[PDB]
Scaffold this active site. Structure first.
Site, mmCIF file in Angstrom:
data_model
loop_
_atom_site.group_PDB
_atom_site.id
_atom_site.type_symbol
_atom_site.label_atom_id
_atom_site.label_comp_id
_atom_site.label_asym_id
_atom_site.label_seq_id
_atom_site.Cartn_x
_atom_site.Cartn_y
_atom_site.Cartn_z
ATOM 1 N N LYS A 133 1.498 -62.242 54.996
ATOM 2 C CA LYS A 133 1.765 -61.384 56.145
ATOM 3 C C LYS A 133 2.797 -61.892 57.111
ATOM 4 O O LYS A 133 3.325 -61.102 57.891
ATOM 5 C CB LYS A 133 0.482 -61.069 56.885
ATOM 6 C CG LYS A 133 -0.535 -60.378 56.006
ATOM 7 C CD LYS A 133 -0.037 -59.066 55.411
ATOM 8 C CE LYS A 133 -1.161 -58.061 55.308
ATOM 9 N NZ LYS A 133 -2.478 -58.715 55.002
HETATM 10 C C1 LIG Z 1 -3.269 -58.089 53.928
HETATM 11 C C2 LIG Z 1 -3.858 -59.018 52.939
HETATM 12 C C3 LIG Z 1 -3.854 -58.707 51.562
HETATM 13 C C4 LIG Z 1 -3.333 -57.406 51.019
HETATM 14 O O1 LIG Z 1 -1.898 -57.393 51.076
HETATM 15 P P1 LIG Z 1 -1.121 -56.065 51.528
HETATM 16 O O2 LIG Z 1 0.359 -56.330 51.677
HETATM 17 O O3 LIG Z 1 -1.738 -55.673 52.849
HETATM 18 O O4 LIG Z 1 -1.495 -55.043 50.449
HETATM 19 C C5 LIG Z 1 -4.423 -59.610 50.699
HETATM 20 N N1 LIG Z 1 -5.022 -60.743 51.077
HETATM 21 C C6 LIG Z 1 -5.074 -61.027 52.383
HETATM 22 C C7 LIG Z 1 -5.886 -62.224 52.771
HETATM 23 C C8 LIG Z 1 -4.478 -60.212 53.359
HETATM 24 O O5 LIG Z 1 -4.836 -60.385 54.673
#
Ligand SMILES: *Cc1c(COP(=O)(O)O)cnc(C)c1O
Ligand code: HEM
Ligand code: HEM
Ligand SMILES: Cc1ncc(COP(=O)(O)O)c(CNOCC(=O)O)c1O
Lengths: 500, 500
Positions: B79
């Site tokens: 993220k």
């Molecule tokens: C947000 C997130 C995901 C999923 O990824 P996206 O880009 O939102 O589909 C997977 N694992 C964790 C720990 C995340 O916080």
């Protein structure tokens, strides 16, 4: 052999001005990493060098201040370099054979590095760590499959029950076991001499005026300093030692009225064999309070998610580099990650408990509304319902009475949670519940009870864990004065400062 | 007004086959980073691709299994890419001005990324996060300076109390505030399309047969899959969705009893605008037990200090990639780090409490001595001394009586701690104490009491936190039967193993 002291005088005949050809040691040159790493151990080294943008200016530094971020290594610390190097050299030497046992006395990070490599390479790993070291270190060590032994924090190094003493005692009882011994092993400072120092020179284009590094075993400062004295003699070497430790010179710096400290990884009651104090130009003593103040500042102002000793280092750097001018450069080593200290300096409760945050003097940066009471919010008395109510009848009563939410309170007066009109409607319209169902799947069970006389500061803290705070009567538990959420607090604060 | 649904149908006219020249979006090309990073935000991207060596083989995979390790980013997760890109794009398009407020509904990792960027760039940051998310996320957010609001875990997305509903309600009360909105913002999947996907292709030489990714917002799988379908069309896109979520297709996979789960960051009760399910070739439903079993396996066997959703992804990968032959390649996305789950899946107590670990599977793998009692060690009753004893007299009595240590017990029977011959002598020789001093400065006050009837397994756990275990009587005034250390258990196990 029974035991080899971790402070025995070094037999290294290294001298500044002596060429590399005369070295009896094996030197590993940094290697080009392939596109796909064969294992996580290749993600040790080539750590970033990041400019410090606010802290240097804040403390009146004129020079450029850069941080070598060692917490980006696979295990989260600078010690991953010596863990890998000690194992590789021992493997090459014939000392370490497949499936053998590695035993290591450590303050945590060398243990994690060795446990991680042991997990990958298939070695049994036993770590001996003092009692003061964080439970977060224990958690990671356990997860990596390491066996853990603890020693008293205040045990003198030459006592049978020190982390060093216990490691040798266990080795004597376990066949096919080895103590790589970071306090004596040349692989420790040589890892920094061959790689960490080469990265710093590469990243700085060979131009560097000062290096500040905290000292534990002394491998980092020794390895980096020996290389820098050869490649960049103008670079001043600044060593950081905690109050309570005896590593600093002159000895006058070590006369203190306290023997214990909270910072982990730095300072010792002996001079490690790998530490070459002759290559350190100046020492500064640090304390826990400034170490944790600076570690929290590094996170809050620079976004560097580092540990305690990283704070000690920068706390010294802002004093030590004052003499540098505009155009000049100071590099600090940030040894480990915040992961090891989640429930320690990262916790305000822990900082308060240890006396590192003066609560009375902390209230100076606290908002105008912090000390006001909950009752001043102008609470609206909420409608309450029994847990026996249906989903349909909940919609009927909330809409009929003009309420958007209602706490659920049983016949005995126990508050069970909250039900909202919005959530009940959304659940019904999506077929999650039927009108005749009880509110079990829709009720919000988690909440915190608060008094009319509690502070808004207390409320603010509560709202970082729960969506709503229920204001209750000390003498009538079933009686709810109001329901408070983050939105109610914002509305209050904003309205007050939109008229004054 | 007041809100824009995070599940509104995508108005994107992209379709496979459309040339990149037709895109109306801004596309950033990954460029070489400088030797010295101007700030920590440049330490986002260029994540390692690491070969999985044990787990794949353990489950019978014939293909190469590779892991894209996103937990090496500045904030600890994938993220950090979207947090930086959403901010950069908003600054460049003029929507985000210096000193504005950023409000974001998040499961934690996007909030951490945004808080880190806000701490560096000087923006006010407000995070709205569901109640289930770990307290470790809260602690990092607090340290970065973010304001934290929580929402009920069981709040439907379209109810006013959901994380998205609350974020919009806050924005409407705060002037100069913006919701970058990871659920609808093209900058989310575009970050992955432009950078993450190109890195995967560079790292694989453009050759990979399967990509497995867990799904939350859908930005990761959508961005990667749109680029991979264009440049590596033979690659199978596998989506991972937890039981309780509705993201997976066909809808038949989603017909589960419960809608709550412990894994964080994946699954939703709505289809995010940024998620393009047409580019996912197959979905797999994952559960909590396998996610945590696999995350623990990744740590123990691969030394990958990753989080829960990384375990969900690998749990599915070992099933999805069974169709691949030797010479083929499967890539898994490992989104975050173990730092967010220190007291959750990393803790055996938490795993037990949650039912993800059973005493049966906890046992079996236990050594032969695990269920023996402390009494079976063959304890020797120790010599005890009063707290008024001098340092000199302690040396005399221990040497005279032939003991190396002694518990310190007052006249009322209270155990104050332990003293040792070695530590007392070292303290005296180093000048810390004088012969006539009482032992207050040398005593080891930390120890754990254990019963004769407790197991050696219990002792072993105790020995991971304390050096000394004092065996006592619950009926007598804390009378000591013996003192046990890790050496004493090893001596018992090694001698009995020789006899066996
Ligand atoms: C947000 C997130 C995901 C999923 O990824 P996206 O880009 O939102 O589909 C997977 N694992 C964790 C720990 C995340 O916080
Ligand atoms: C190139 C110049 C050097 C020379 C001539 C030299 C020479 C020696 C010799 C003769 C020994 C004793 C035998 C042994 O333990 O192998 C030794 C030990 C050692 N060297 Fe070097 N060395 C050099 C550079 C270095 C550097 C750069 C480091 C730092 C990383 C280093 C660290 C050590 C350590 C820690 C020991 C162990 C001391 C002991 O066992 O007491 N040496 N060296
Ligand atoms: C063939 C190329 C593409 C075309 C023609 C296209 C076109 C569009 C258009 C016209 C919009 C409307 C809003 C705007 O103009 O800003 C849009 C929105 C969007 N695009 Fe693109 N796009 C393309 C590629 C992509 C790619 C590669 C991604 C990322 C994986 C992407 C993700 C999105 C998202 C998430 C939205 C938001 C939808 C909404 O506005 O509701 N698009 N696209
Ligand atoms: C957090 C931290 N900071 C600073 C340092 C000091 O580095 P050095 O020992 O190379 O001077 C260390 C090294 N501690 O001793 C080895 C260990 O982790 O077991 C450290 O862990």
């Amino acid at each position: 052999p029974l035991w080899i002291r971790p402070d025995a005088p070094s037999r290294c005949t290294w001298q500044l001005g002596r060429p590399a050809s005369e070295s009896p040691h094996h030197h590993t040159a940094p290697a080009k990493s392939p596109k796909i790493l064969p294992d996580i151990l290749k993600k040790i080294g080539d750590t970033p060098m990041v400019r410090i943008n606010k802290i240097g200016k804040k403390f009146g530094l004129k020079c450029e201040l850069l941080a070598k971020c060692e917490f980006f290594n696979a295990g989260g610390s600078v010690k991953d370099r010596i863990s890998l190097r000690m194992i590789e050299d021992a493997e090459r030497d014939g000392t370490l054979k497949p499936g053998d046992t590695i035993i290591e006395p450590t303050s945590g990070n060398t243990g994690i590095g060795l446990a991680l490599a042991a997990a990958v390479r298939g070695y049994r790993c036993i770590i001996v760590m003092p009692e003061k070291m964080s439970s977060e270190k224990v958690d990671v060590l356990r997860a990596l499959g390491a066996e853990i032994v603890r020693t008293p924090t205040n045990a003198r190094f030459d006592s049978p029950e020190s982390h060093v003493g216990v490691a040798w005692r266990l080795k004597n009882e376990i066949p096919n076991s080895h103590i790589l011994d970071q306090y004596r092993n040349a692989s420790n400072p040589l890892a920094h001499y061959d790689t960490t120092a080469d990265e710093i020179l590469q990243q700085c284009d060979g131009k560097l005026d000062m290096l500040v590094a905290s000292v534990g075993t002394g491998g980092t400062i020794t390895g980096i300093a020996r290389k820098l004295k050869e490649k960049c003699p103008g670079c001043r070497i600044i060593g950081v030692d905690p109050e309570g430790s005896i590593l600093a010179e002159p000895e006058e710096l070590n006369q203190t009225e306290q023997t214990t400290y909270e910072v982990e990884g730095i300072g010792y009651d002996f001079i490690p064999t790998v530490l070459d104090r002759t290559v350190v130009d100046k020492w500064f003593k640090s304390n826990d309070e400034e170490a944790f103040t600076f570690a929290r500042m590094l996170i809050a102002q620079e976004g560097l998610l580092c540990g305690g000793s990283a704070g000690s280092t920068v706390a010294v750097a802002v004093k030590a580099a004052q003499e540098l001018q505009e155009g000049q450069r100071c590099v600090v080593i940030l040894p480990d990650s915040v992961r090891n200290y989640m429930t320690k300096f990262l916790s305000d409760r822990w900082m308060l408990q240890k006396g590192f945050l003066k609560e009375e003097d902390l209230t100076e940066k606290k908002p105008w509304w912090w000390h006001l009471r909950v009752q001043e919010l102008g609470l609206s008395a909420p409608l309450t319902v029994l847990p026996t109510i249906t989903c349909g009848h909940t919609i009927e009563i909330l809409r009929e009475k003009g309420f958007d939410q209602a706490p659920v309170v049983d016949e005995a007066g126990v508050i069970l949670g909250m039900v909202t009109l919005g959530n009940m409607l959304s659940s019904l319209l999506a077929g999650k519940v039927q009108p005749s169902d009880q509110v079990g799947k829709v009720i919000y069970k988690q909440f915190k009870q608060i008094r009319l006389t509690d502070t808004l500061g207390r409320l603010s803290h509560i709202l970082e864990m729960d969506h709503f705070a229920l204001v209750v009567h000390e003498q009538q538990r079933q009686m709810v004065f109001g329901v408070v959420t983050a939105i109610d607090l914002l509305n209050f604060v904003a309205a007050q400062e939109r008229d004054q």
